[PDB]
Amino acid sequence: PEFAIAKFDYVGRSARELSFKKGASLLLYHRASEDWWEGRHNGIDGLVPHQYIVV
């Protein structure tokens, strides 16, 4: 359960993706693959792209 900060805006195109703004704080639960994390933002659980966040 890692705290992450968004390095750039991400606009999800799927209900499986979270959308967030650069600078946002996100909670990352688990590293699903080298490119995806299961996380939560804005009270919603979903996938977070590794390329847009920093831990």
Side-chain angles (χ1 to χ4, degrees), residues 4-20:
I5 290 294
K7 300 188 299 181
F8 202 85
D9 286 8
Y10 188 74
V11 183
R13 262 61 189 201
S14 188
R16 305 186 176 185
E17 296 166 88
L18 296 193
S19 283
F20 49 86

Side-chain angles (χ1 to χ4, degrees), residues 21-49:
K21 295 256 286 67
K22 175 171 61 75
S25 160
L26 296 90
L27 198 53
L28 303 181
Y29 293 114
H30 187 256
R31 190 61 173 280
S33 81
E34 211 268 329
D35 314 296
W36 290 103
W37 293 79
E38 298 288 354
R40 178 179 293 184
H41 176 262
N42 198 29
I44 303 159
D45 287 293
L47 296 175
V48 179

